[PDB]
């Protein structure tokens, strides 16, 4: 039916028997930069198979008091195979992403997760005068956790989930490309993100520029005697990745 779906990228495949649909960005499928949009003159690199493939991040464990998590991209993929390698040797880069969040339950479990990709998600620090340090913003392959109370710390991020680290209403995050994992309905959510930026290409190490947030709006719940370990796995795949500006490796 329309609940089944498969996605093959590179030498990787993801099957889902209980999905909702695919959310495709803003109706735009990711493509390669055209000649009339390009400004960098050297012939770009396009690995096209070794990089445009699925990578699985580190899983988290959904608990009854989990406020939520977030990843930064492509910082989360900065050490993932040849995709991270091309990022180090190149000054400029460009990709779109297929994002697949997967969480299965027992049909007696309940809870609803919001899965959203926020472009240019600039986050505030817990101390108003300071700035968040590098690790609080993006731990790479590891998720940074939202809090269900005000954060403290000179370099900490204001991770109170009610504002989503950005100073907005967390219920208003549905303006971005989003989906819901509702345990009674579906065990996965997938979003295809095109490349969004104010320039045709950017440095992949000092800019993201979208964040993945997973926020439980309905908490996890079950009766005693059921499985209590409900993990959420994240599998991202860059699409149409190209690179410009080859030189020595860094960072």
């Amino acid at each position: 039916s329309d609940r089944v779906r498969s996605i093959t990228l590179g030498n990787s495949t993801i099957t889902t028997q209980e999905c909702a649909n695919v959310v495709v960005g803003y109706g735009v499928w990711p493509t390669y930069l055209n000649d009339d949009e390009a400004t960098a003159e050297d012939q770009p690199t396009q690995p096209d198979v070794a990089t445009c493939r699925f990578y699985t991040l580190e899983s988290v464990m959904w608990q009854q008091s989990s406020p939520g998590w977030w990843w930064k991209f492509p910082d989360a993929l900065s050490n993932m195979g040849l995709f991270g390698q091309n990022m180090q040797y190149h000054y400029l880069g460009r990709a779109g992403y297929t994002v697949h969040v997967q969480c299965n339950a027992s049909k007696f479990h309940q809870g609803c997760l919001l899965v959203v990709c926020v472009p240019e998600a600039e986050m505030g620090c817990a101390t108003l005068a300071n700035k968040p340090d590098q690790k609080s913003l993006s731990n790479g392959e590891t998720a940074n956790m939202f809090e269900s109370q005000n954060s403290t710390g000179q370099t900490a991020v204001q991770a109170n989930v009610i504002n989503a680290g950005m100073g907005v209403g967390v219920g208003n995050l549905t303006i971005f490309p989003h989906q819901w994992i509702n345990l009674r309905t579906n065990n996965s959510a997938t979003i295809v993100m095109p490349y969004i930026n104010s320039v045709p290409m950017d440095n992949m190490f000092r800019h993201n520029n979208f964040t993945l947030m997973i926020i439980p709006f309905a908490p996890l719940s079950y009766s005693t005697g059921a499985t209590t370990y409900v993990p959420i796995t994240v599998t991202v795949a860059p699409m149409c990745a190209e690179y410009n500006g080859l030189r020595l490796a860094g960072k």
Partner: protein, 273 residues
């Protein structure tokens, strides 16, 4: 015409079609109209969305800063400057920040007003005042005194204005080096990620300098210049949720955590509000 949809007539239904039931997990926003869950009449709707276009929503003159400069000074040091930004006021900052990217031309207007100061320099009879606003793009020579050589404005654009006349106005095109102005930036300035993080990385617009072209008279005087921005020929991309928490700084998005809304007594109180 930004004319809204007419309401179609609909009678009773009994069938298998389920317009009211859907899956909100898909991320799709349901397209149900009132004609799907009740008998409707036919309404020829002549209402238009002409006022909610992004051009009309943004094409309003807004004050973005004002500063003061005097005529006597020391020594002097009686002139004004403003490092151009759109993030020092709450009202225009929240409208521009409903989008992630914007391209537009500006209509720049100034409102210069002078005030007499307390003193005992009677009697004072001062001729009309003339002000010079100079714009120095990034890298150009900065005025250090109120009479330094930079005010010659050989290549720097400047407007001269005498009091009592219409407030001066000029147009500025879209001047960024990127393909769009960024309201939000989620990176650092340096490749090693040390240094400035956020939208301050891309703030390199320049500086405005103000002074009296007149030589200072005996009576003390302080002038204040109000800058007004008006976006023109607008194009916006990627709308985002409106700012909920009150701003704190101009360079960053730092906030104090705020409640989602105003609370009420219980889940059923109709006194809202």
């Amino acid at each position: 015409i930004a004319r809204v949809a007419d309401t179609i007539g609909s009678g009773p239904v009994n069938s298998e079609s389920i317009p009211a039931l859907t899956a909100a997990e898909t991320g799709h926003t349901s397209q149900v109209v009132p004609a799907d869950t009740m008998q409707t009449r036919h309404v020829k709707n002549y209402h238009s969305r002409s006022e909610s276009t992004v051009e009309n929503f943004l094409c309003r003159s807004a004050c973005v800063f004002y500063t003061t400069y005097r005529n006597h000074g020391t020594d002097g040091d009686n002139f004004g400057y403003w490092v151009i930004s759109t993030r020092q006021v709450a009202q225009l900052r929240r409208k521009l920040e409903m989008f992630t990217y914007a391209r537009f031309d500006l209509e720049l207007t100034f409102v210069i007003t002078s005030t007499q100061e307390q003193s005992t320099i009677q009697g004072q009879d001062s001729p009309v005042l003339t002000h010079q606003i100079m714009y120095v793009p990034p890298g150009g020579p900065v005025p250090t005194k109120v009479n330094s050589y930079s005010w010659q404005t050989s290549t720097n654009p400047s407007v001269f204005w005498t009091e009592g006349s219409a407030p001066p106005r000029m147009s500025i095109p879209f001047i960024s080096i990127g393909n769009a102005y960024s309201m939000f930036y989620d990176g650092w300035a340096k490749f090693d990620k040390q240094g400035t993080y956020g939208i301050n990385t891309l703030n390199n617009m320049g500086t405005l300098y103000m002074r009296h072209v007149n030589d200072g008279s005996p009576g003390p005087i302080v002038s204040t210049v109000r800058i007004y921005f008006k976006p023109k020929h607008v194009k916006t991309w990627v709308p985002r949720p409106p700012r909920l928490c009150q701003y704190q700084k101009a360079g960053n998005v730092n906030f104090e955590p705020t409640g989602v809304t105003e609370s009420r007594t219980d889940i059923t109180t109709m006194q809202t509000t």
